[PDB]
C-alpha cells in the first residue's frame, strides 16, 4: 500500500515560457489520482512554477538541493529553513550530479537529509552505483553503504523519505535498467531496510527508479513488485511524456 510516486527533476533547464507551457499541459492532463506527483524546478523558478499550478494540492514542488546548515554566510546556497518559509514541501538530496560534478560526499548528504527532515521537509534521497562499480560486481556493496550513510545513521522517522535508486550509468545515457536489473536492486534494498532498520520501514518506504525512464519503458518497470515509481530527468521536460509516466500503472 505504498503510494506510487513520480518525480520530475528538471535539472538546470527552463524559461518562463517553457515552464508555463509545461505546467499548463500538466494542469490540463488526466492524471492517475493514485500517483503522488512532484516536480523540481530550478530554485529561481520555484515560485513561478508553483504559481502556475491550477491544482496545487495535486502536484507538489521540490527544490533540487539545499545546504547542510541553518541560515548564514554561505553565498550561493539555499537553506532548508528557506524552503520551509516558502512552504516548499520536498527536496532532492544526494543526486548523482551533485556527487560527481560538485563533490558532495556521503557525509555531507547525511547532514543535509537530517537537517531537511528536521525542518519539516520531505526528502527524495538519491543513491546509485557507477558503471565501473556495476561491472566489477560492487552494486549492492555501494548502494547499501550509501543508504546506511545518508539515512540509516541519523534518521529515526522514515515517514517523509523516498529512496531514489538511479544507477549512474543510466542517467541521461539512453541506457535504462532492465526491469529485472532494477527489481533486483530494489528488492535487495528493501531486504536491507527490513533487516537493518525495521520491517515497518521496509514495508512503507517508497523506492523509486531513475535513469532514462521514458513513456515507452515505464510500463514494464512499474509492474515490478518493489519499484514504487520513478525519478524522471530528460522526459520530465516533455510534458506529454511525463503525463504517460505518471500514468504508468494505468
x/- mask, its own copies, residues 87-126, rule CB under 8 A, reads -----x--x-xx--xxx-----------------------
Which of the residues 217 through 236 are near its own copies (CB under 8 A)? 233-234
C-alpha to C-alpha distance for 110 and 8, rounded to whole angstroms: 23
Q: DSSP secondary structure string, 199-214? A: HHHHHH--EEEESS--
C-alpha to C-alpha distance for 64 and 6, rounded to whole angstroms: 15
Q: Is 200 a catalytic residue?
A: no
Rounded to the nearest 5°, which phi and psi values hold at 177? Answer: -60, 145
Which of the residues 39 through 78 are near its own copies (CB under 8 A)? 42-48, 63-65, 67, 69, 71-78
Q: Is 95 a catalytic residue?
A: yes
Contact with its own copies (CB under 8 A) among 14, 167, 210, 229: 14
C-alpha to C-alpha distance for 61 and 75, rounded to whole angstroms: 24
From the list 97, 104, 129, 166, the catalytic residue is: 166
Please list the active-site residues: 95, 166
Residues interacting with its own copies, by CB under 8 A? 9, 11-16, 42-48, 63-65, 67, 69, 71-79, 82-83, 85-86, 92, 95, 97-98, 101-103, 171-172, 233-234
Amino acid at each position: 500500500s505504498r503510494k506510487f510516486f513520480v518525480g520530475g527533476n528538471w535539472k538546470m533547464n527552463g524559461t518562463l515560457e517553457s515552464i508555463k507551457a509545461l505546467v499548463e499541459t500538466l494542469n490540463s492532463a488526466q492524471l492517475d489520482p493514485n500517483t503522488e506527483v512532484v516536480v523540481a524546478p530550478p530554485a529561481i523558478y520555484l515560485p513561478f512554477a508553483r504559481s502556475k499550478l491550477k491544482k496545487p494540492k495535486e502536484i507538489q514542488v521540490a527544490a533540487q538541493n539545499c545546504y547542510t546548515k541553518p541560515n548564514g554566510a554561505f553565498t550561493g546556497e539555499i537553506s532548508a529553513e528557506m524552503l520551509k518559509d516558502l512552504g516548499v514541501p520536498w527536496v532532492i538530496l544526494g543526486h548523482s550530479e551533485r556527487r560527481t560534478i560538485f563533490g558532495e560526499s556521503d557525509e555531507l548528504i547525511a547532514e543535509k537529509v537530517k537537517y531537511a527532515l528536521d525542518q519539516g521537509l520531505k526528502v527524495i534521497a538519491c543513491i546509485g552505483e557507477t558503471l565501473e562499480e556495476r561491472e566489477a560486481g560492487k552494486t549492492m556493496e555501494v548502494v547499501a553503504r550509501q543508504i546506511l550513510k545518508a539515512i540509516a545513521d541519523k534518521i529515526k522517522d522514515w515517514s517523509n523519505v523516498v529512496i531514489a535508486y538511479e544507477p549512474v550509468w543510466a542517467i541521461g545515457t539512453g541506457k535504462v535498467a532492465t526491469p529485472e536489473q532494477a527489481q533486483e536492486v530494489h528488492a535487495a534494498l528493501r531486504k536491507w531496510l527490513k533487516e537493518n532498520v525495521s520491517p515497518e520501514v521496509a514495508e512503507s518506504t517508497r523506492i523509486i527508479y531513475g535513469g532514462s525512464v521514458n513513456a515507452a519503458n515505464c510500463k514494464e518497470l512499474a509492474k515490478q513488485p518493489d519499484i514504487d515509481g520513478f525519478l524522471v530527468g530528460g522526459a520530465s521536460l516533455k510534458a506529454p511524456e511525463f503525463v504517460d509516466i505518471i500514468n504508468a500503472r494505468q
